[model samples]
Target: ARCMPCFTTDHQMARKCDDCCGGKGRGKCYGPQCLCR
Candidate 1:
């Protein structure tokens, strides 16, 4: 098994893939801290 179905909410990409690899939470955007999805 694996936590293999995760992705950024924006539908593109997100921070380091290791952000959450244990079925805990989703990823986030990089710097420039502005938009969100």
Candidate 2:
């Protein structure tokens, strides 16, 4: 599995990743503070 790179600015990257990436990019959070992958 490939992990989406961690935050550069916005800390809540996983939230957006879970919602947006899940539907298209096929990525999601592994856990809290975890970068979505």
Predicted model with the maximum TM-score: 2
Q: Which stretches of candidate 2 lie over 4 Å from their true place?
A: 1-7, 22-37
Model 1 score (lDDT)? 0.35
Candidate 1 lDDT by residue in tens digits, 1-37: 2223334464433333334342223433344232222
The 10-residue segment of model 2 with minimum total lDDT is 28-37
What lDDT score belongs to each candidate, Candidate 1 first?
A: 0.35, 0.52
Q: Please give, for residues 1-37, the per-residue lDDT of candidate 2 as tens digits.
A: 4355435376766566665555545555554333434
lDDT agreement of model 2 with the native: 0.52
TM-score of each: 0.17, 0.34
